[PDB]
Ligand binder design. Sequence first.
Ligand SMILES: [K+]
Ligand SMILES: [K+]
Ligand SMILES: [K+]
Ligand SMILES: [Mg+2]
Ligand SMILES: [Mg+2]
Ligand SMILES: [Mg+2]
Ligand SMILES: [Mg+2]
Ligand SMILES: [Mg+2]
Ligand SMILES: [Mg+2]
Ligand SMILES: [Mg+2]
Ligand SMILES: [Mg+2]
Ligand SMILES: [Mg+2]
Ligand SMILES: [Mg+2]
Ligand SMILES: [Mg+2]
Ligand SMILES: [Mg+2]
Ligand SMILES: [Mg+2]
Ligand SMILES: [Mg+2]
Lengths: 72, 113, 108, 176
Amino acid sequence: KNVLKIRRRKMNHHKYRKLVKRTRFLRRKVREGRLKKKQIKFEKDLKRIWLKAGLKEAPENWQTPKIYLKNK
Amino acid sequence: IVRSSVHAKWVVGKVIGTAMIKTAKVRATRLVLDPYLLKYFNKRKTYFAHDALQQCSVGDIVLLRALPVPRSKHVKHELAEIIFKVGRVIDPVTGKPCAGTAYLESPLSEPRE
Amino acid sequence: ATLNQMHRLGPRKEPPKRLGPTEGRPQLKGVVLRTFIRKPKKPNSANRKCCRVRLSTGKEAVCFIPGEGHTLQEHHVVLVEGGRTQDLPGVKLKVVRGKYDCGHVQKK
Amino acid sequence: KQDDEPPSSAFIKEYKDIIPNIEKVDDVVKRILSLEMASRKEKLKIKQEQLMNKIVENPEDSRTLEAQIIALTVRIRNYEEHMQKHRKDKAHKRHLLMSIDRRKKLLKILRQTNYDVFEKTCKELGVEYTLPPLHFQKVHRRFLAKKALCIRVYQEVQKLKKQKRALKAAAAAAKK
RNA sequence: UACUUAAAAUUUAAGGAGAGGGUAUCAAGCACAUUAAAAUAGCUUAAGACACCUUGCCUAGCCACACCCCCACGGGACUCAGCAGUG
RNA sequence: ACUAUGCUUAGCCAUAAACCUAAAUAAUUAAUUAACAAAACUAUUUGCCAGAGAACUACUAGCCAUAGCUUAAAACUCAAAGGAC
Ligand SMILES: [K+]
Ligand SMILES: [K+]
Ligand SMILES: [K+]
Ligand SMILES: [Mg+2]
Ligand SMILES: [Mg+2]
Ligand SMILES: [Mg+2]
Ligand SMILES: [Mg+2]
Ligand SMILES: [Mg+2]
Ligand SMILES: [Mg+2]
Ligand SMILES: [Mg+2]
Ligand SMILES: [Mg+2]
Ligand SMILES: [Mg+2]
Ligand SMILES: [Mg+2]
Ligand SMILES: [Mg+2]
Ligand SMILES: [Mg+2]
Ligand SMILES: [Mg+2]
Ligand SMILES: [Mg+2]
């Protein structure tokens, strides 16, 4: 078979790689902010749980782990 | 001595768990007809059963009797009998211990032990 | 698929029928906003008479005006219907001749 | 380690029962036919035979589930010793993990067929059998952290209830 | 409706053999269990839990609603979704 | 001409036309030519597919991955695209 369908994907992937290259710095700031919102949503979801259970403060010796930050 | 309301007056199933005190979680299966294919498949249900003596082990076939009054929200049956014990089956036809499709004790013999 | 696989999935999942320019309604009433010409994609050649309208739903759409010659102007009221103009891409509505301000084509 | 390791003076399994019959054999000949001048594979044939005698009712049969389990316990401990020196051998790490899984499958069938034999084999071979969990549990940082708090929140709520019950009962006792 | 005690119609409550919409890019829910000396650490879930969205269905008919606040002590923007009629 | 790099020691990344483009298992070779390729075909079980493009994309979650990988749409456009000859 011909490679025509592969050529379409070849151009799509090439053009996408250069688009990511152009806006690489913008994408980095988008991600750090999407992860920060991802963390706040995680923290709030944990606060909802204990408040609904009837606790007025989080369980003793508990600190929500920061799981989306540059910990590794 | 009125009997239970529940439809399942007698249910057979396998003991899939025994981590609750004096209770055995049992999985029963029934055959339900697929209307499109007109073939029977297995619909399985979970039944909590009162195991008074904690004499049940995971994997054994058991017979449950519907309790007249529900003991709790989910415990509405008791353990009538253990049809097959896991690994300790006794052949109904001959009465001799078996281990799969074989006799641990020959039916010709009469050990009476 | 095997009978066990057909049983676990059942009948084919059916994508919902998304609505069109009229929002699944026989007709809509709109007020003309502008009258302009659209060019039929190649290989056709014409100066097709179209107009923008604000429909009762509140959105704005481009509507082809059929017939030889229309008197439509801004602020006029028209009854739009479905039916795409094949040569005109994006024009999914048509005006009904003989209703509200739009009138029947003057016969020659 | 394990209670039994074959001595270096022991004969190989081919001549284990033949040299005793022979009236007189030199020290050198015994040393050539001992486990000191043999490969590791020979020392493993002696380890297995010892375990079959001490566990299996009929050591003549090697096709029973109990015997097959014993054959895999020697291999599993052999693969483990290999992997203690060859830390980056990925083919033998696969052999070790696949034999462990094979034993679990055989132990499951043994439990379902002959429970009495199953209990002895696990006690003698020192193999713990854990039953397969009904439901698979996913694991990732977000889940493990939420599941830890939820367990902690519950415990705190229950601890408070116990304290309240004690205080309520204590007040009632004083009134009585 | 009968009898000084029994036949119906019509409802209510607690349930369960089986059946019962969509999205799995909703994959975990977070107390959802059992025992009954009050301890045990359990319960549901890819055989689809939980979440969210959409729709009256079961059709000799049934279900829900009755100005709004799921309810209606209370409060509010204060009543035709009875017939006809109006904006 | 010369560097990153190909090498070694640890750790990471998890992608290939990773394709022999043919899942695994047990058969059967007559009652059997869409074309081409590596003859046809039955049973069992799982996975996957449902016009083309948009799209190895957007968003979501997981990940030692931070110009990344896996997961993977819709609007919109067309009356075809595609395979073999
Ligand atoms: K033309
Ligand atoms: K209401
Ligand atoms: K190839
Ligand atoms: Mg070629
Ligand atoms: Mg392209
Ligand atoms: Mg998405
Ligand atoms: Mg009103
Ligand atoms: Mg009301
Ligand atoms: Mg009226
Ligand atoms: Mg009224
Ligand atoms: Mg160099
Ligand atoms: Mg390298
Ligand atoms: Mg790939
Ligand atoms: Mg290759
Ligand atoms: Mg790629
Ligand atoms: Mg991507
Ligand atoms: Mg992404």
